[PDB]
Design a protein around this ligand. Structure first.
Ligand SMILES: *[C@@H]1O[C@H](CO)[C@@H](O)[C@H](O)[C@H]1NC(C)=O
Lengths: 48, 42
């Protein structure tokens, strides 16, 4: 594709274009993921 | 300087005065949970 768009040359990005007028199951969701590690270690982080 | 059980231990002492005479104990200063392997220093 020599670095130009065309047939079978699609940019692997797509936009969202969020608007307040969409349906309930369409607005973006802010997501976080917390991962722990249950092993034998100095155990730096501990709860209250 | 000591390194045991995944902890680095540093004891320290200061005095204003070849090594002198007398007795003076060293008080604990810092403990650190680093957990590395130590073989040489500089
Ligand atoms: C530290 O290194 C020495 C020599 O490479 C090795 O014999 C020893 O098992 C190591 N210890 C740890 C806790 O990695």
């Amino acid at each position: 594709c020599n670095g130009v768009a065309g047939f079978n040359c699609y940019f692997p990005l797509r936009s969202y274009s969020f608007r307040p007028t969409y349906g309930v199951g369409h607005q973006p969701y802010r997501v976080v993921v917390l991962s722990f590690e249950l092993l034998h270690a100095p155990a730096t982080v501990c709860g209250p | 300087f000591k390194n045991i059980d995944g902890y680095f231990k540093i004891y320290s002492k200061h005095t204003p005065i070849d090594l002198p005479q007398g007795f003076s104990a060293l008080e604990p200063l810092v403990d650190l949970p680093i957990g590395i392997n130590i073989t040489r220093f500089q």
